[PDB]
Chains A and B, each alone.
Chain A
C-alpha cells in the first residue's frame, strides 16, 4: 500500500491540490526508481499543461514519445501543446503516421483536424472533427474543437449548440463552459457570460484565459 497509494494518488485531477501531486512525484522518483515510468511523465506533463507550461510539455513529451510514439494517453496533451506552439511540421508528421497506424481511432482524426486548424483550413477541420467526435462520444477535445471550427468559420448559431452539447455531456469540465462564454462575448450577450465565467473561475483561480476573459 505504501507505493500503490501514491500511484493511485498520481492519477487524480490536477486543478486542485496540485502541490501534493508534485510531492508524490518526487516520492515516486526517490526510493523506487520510477522516474522513468511513463505515467509519472504523463502526470508531470499534465501538471505542466495545467498552468500552460507548453514548452515543458513539448520537451518532456518529446523525451517520452521517442521511446514510444503511440501511447494514446500521452498523445492528446502533445497535440494541445503543439497547437499552442503553433507548429505544423511535427504535428503533420505525427498525424500522418498515426493515420496509417490507427485508422479507426478518433485520436488520429482529431490530430488531423488540429493540423488543419493550425493551417487555418476550417472547412476540412469541420469534417475531420466531426468524424473524431462520432468515433468517440467521450472525447471532449472533439466537441470543443468542433465548436472552435464553427466559431472561426464565421457562423456561430451552430457553435452555440455545439458548446452546449459539450458542456452537458461532460459535467464538471470548465473549458467547454469557458469557451461557450467567449462565444457569448462574440454575440454581445454578457448576461449569461457572467454566470458562466463565474462558474469557470470557481475552479480555475490562476490561468491566463479566465482572467483575460
Chain B
C-alpha cells in the first residue's frame, strides 16, 4: 500500500514574533 507521508508540524511566525517580543521586554525589564 501507498502510505501517505505523515503531516509535519511547522514553526509559525506568530509564535516566534511573540517570543522575540517577550524577550525584548525581558531585556528591557532590568
Interface residues of A (CB under 8 A from B): 49, 76-77, 80, 83-84, 114, 117, 140-141, 144-145, 148, 151, 175, 178-179, 182, 185-186, 208-209, 212-213
Contact = CB atoms under 8 A, between A and B. Distances in A.
B3 interface: yes
Interface of chain A: mostly helix, strand, loop or mixed: helix
A117 B5 CA distance: 12
Given A117-B2, A208-B6, 15 more contacts: A77-B1, A80-B3, A83-B2, A114-B2, A141-B1, A141-B2, A145-B2, A151-B4, A179-B4, A182-B4, A182-B7, A185-B7, A209-B3, A212-B6, A213-B7
Interface string B1-30: 111101100000000000000000000000
Contacts of A84: 3
A120 to B, nearest CB: 11
Of B1, B2, B7, chain A has the most CB atoms within 10 Å of the CB of: B2
Contacts of B2: 80, 83, 114, 117, 141, 144-145, 148
B7 to A, nearest CB: 6
Contacts of B4: 148, 151, 178-179, 182, 209
10 contacts: A80-B2, A80-B3, A83-B2, A83-B3, A144-B1, A145-B2, A179-B4, A182-B4, A209-B4, A213-B7
Contacts of A175: 1
A145 to B, nearest CB: 4
Of B3, B6, B7, chain A has the most CB atoms within 10 Å of the CB of: B3
Contacts of A49: 1
Nearest to B6: A212
A209 B6 contact: yes
Task: Give the top 5 A-B pairs by smallest Cβ distance, nearest first.
Answer: A145-B2, A80-B1, A212-B6, A179-B4, A182-B4
B1 to A, nearest CB: 5
Contacts of A179: 4
Contacts of A208: 6
Nearest to A212: B6
A115 to B, nearest CB: 12
Nearest to A178: B4
